[PDB]
Amino acid sequence: MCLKLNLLDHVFANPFMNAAGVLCSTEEDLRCMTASSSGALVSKSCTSAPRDGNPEPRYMAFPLGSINSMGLPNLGFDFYLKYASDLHDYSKKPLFLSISGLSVEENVAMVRRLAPVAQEKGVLLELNLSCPNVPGKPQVAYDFEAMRTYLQQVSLAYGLPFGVKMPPYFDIAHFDTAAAVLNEFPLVKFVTCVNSVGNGLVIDAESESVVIKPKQGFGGLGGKYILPTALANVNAFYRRCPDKLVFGCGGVYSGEDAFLHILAGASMVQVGTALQEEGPGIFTRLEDELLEIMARKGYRTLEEFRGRVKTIE
């Protein structure tokens, strides 16, 4: 019985990794994730210049999940590139580097300089599409023409397999359109579904107040709130992108939640809110819990059940 996976010309001890943004901003964070039992790690989505991000409080968690408007605080691309090129121990596990430039030219400049390190050291690029374009327009992955532009330019500049982090969609016609855009780009080898559910609002009844400061308390939701939305997106893209991998992210707190993602079609399974709340010990628990479900069902490997969710009649 084993959780091993071999994909994208790498080997993974198990499918679990951090979600981008969680436990991955500093060298300390990345060393911590490397020391953990996760099968991989991803760095904080970065910009060319360092960013302080939004005013605090900017993250809060509750029994059913979290809300955030971090504002892309990060140490800048040069830091993350140095981590990938000089500091990371690739004999421990694979590394993904997430980018989130504020324009197509910023992403193009970063991927140009990432390429040789990707080719020499094997770092993998995750391009965050659920991200800021021109203010007053929707995030990039909610603007299908912008999404296409970003993918064309990054595919030309980078020239190597990469993947994309996608916001959730809610309408079948959007699933259709988004997957069709992705399927234009053969270098898009993985699709991570999903980023936070955008612009939720948590209010504290005792204080009659929102709980985060930026954007009058509006921010992206994660955790238990979003698991059915996450599953829907993983399965939608799994069915529509037969030549790509899907990585699942959203609502994973247990091996059972991970099993559901994998039934929906997930290859790797990323953990955000629950990892932020529990810490990196979560990965030993998730491994154990997933193995127990496999043992009860007689499954020996992940491929035996990946994407095998049954439908009714």
Ligand X SMILES: Cc1cc2nc3c(=O)[nH]c(=O)nc-3n(C[C@H](O)[C@H](O)[C@H](O)COP(=O)(O)O)c2cc1C
Ligand Y SMILES: O=C(O)c1[nH]c(=O)[nH]c(=O)c1CCc1ccc(-c2ccccc2)cc1
Residues annotated in the binding site, as ranges? 20, 44-45, 68-72, 128, 133, 165, 194-196, 223, 250-251, 272-273
Contacts of ligand Y in 35-74 (CB under 6 A): 45, 54, 68-72
Among 2-10, 102-110, 220-228, 304-312, which window interacts with ligand X (CB under 6 A)?
A: 220-228
Q: Which residues pair with 257 in a beta bridge?
A: none
Instruction: Rule CB under 6 A: say whether 101 interacts with ligand Y.
Output: no
Interacting positions 255-274 with ligand X (CB under 6 A) = 271-274
Q: What is the DSSP letter of 311?
A: P
Q: Residues at the annotated binding site for FMN?
A: 20, 44-45, 128, 165, 194, 223, 250-251, 272-273
Q: Determine contact, residues 197/220, Cβ cutoff 8 Å.
A: yes
Q: With respect to ligand Y, which residue has the nearer C-beta, 90 or 170?
A: 170
Of the candidates 61, 94, 71, the one whose C-alpha atom is nearest the C-alpha of residue 253 is: 61
3-state SS track over 187-241: CEEEEEECCCEEEEECEECCCCEECCCHHHHEEEEECHHHHHHHHHHHHHHHHHC
What is the smallest separation between the CB atom of 106 and ligand X, expressed in angstroms?
15
By CB under 6 A, tell whether 273 contacts ligand Y: no
| Position among 226, 262, 268, 286 found at the interface with ligand X (CB under 6 A) | 226
Tell me the C-alpha distance between 180 and 112, whole Å.
Answer: 26
- Lateral strand order in the sheet of 65-68: 59-62, 65-68, 218-222, 197-201
Site membership for ligand X, residue 223 (CB under 6 A): yes
* Catalytic status, residue 193: no
Torsion, Cα of 223, 100, 166, 29 (10° steps): -40
> 195, 229, 273, 276: which one contacts ligand Y (CB under 6 A)?
195
What backbone torsions phi and psi does residue 242 show, to the nearest 5 degrees?
-65, -25
123 binds, among ligand Y, a second copy, ligand X, none (CB under 5 to 8 A by kind): none
Which candidate, 282, 80, 276, 254, places its Cα nearest to that of 196?
Answer: 276
Annotated binding site for substrate: 44, 68-72, 128, 133, 195-196
Site membership for ligand X, residue 222 (CB under 6 A): yes
* Selected catalytic residue, list 2, 32, 46, 131: 131
**Whose Cβ is closer to a second copy: residue 200's or residue 280's?**
200
With the C-alpha atoms ordered 269, 274, 277, 283, is the resulting torsion angle positive or negative?
negative
The closest alpha carbon to 132, from 149, 146, 111, 122, belongs to 146
Cα distance between residue 223 and residue 237, in whole Å: 20
d(Cα 26, Cα 30) in Å, to the nearest integer?
A: 6
Range 33-72, binding a second copy (CB under 8 A): 55, 57, 64, 67
Residue 184: what are its φ and ψ, rounded to 5°?
A: -70, -20
Distance in Å, CB of 120 to ligand Y, minimum: 27
Please name every residue paired with 124 in a beta bridge, in sequence order, or none if there are none: 96
Neighbours of 186 (CB within 10 A): 10
Q: Which stretch binds ligand Y (CB under 6 A): 87-95, 125-133, 287-295, 299-307?
A: 125-133
Binding positions for a second copy, rule: CB under 8 A: 55, 57, 64, 67, 136-139, 142, 167-176, 197-203, 205, 207-210, 212-213, 215-218, 221, 224-229, 231-232, 235-236, 256, 259-260, 263-264, 293, 305, 308-313
Q: Which residues are catalytic?
A: 131
Binding positions for ligand Y, rule: CB under 6 A: 21, 45, 54, 68-72, 100, 128, 130-132, 195-196, 214-215, 220
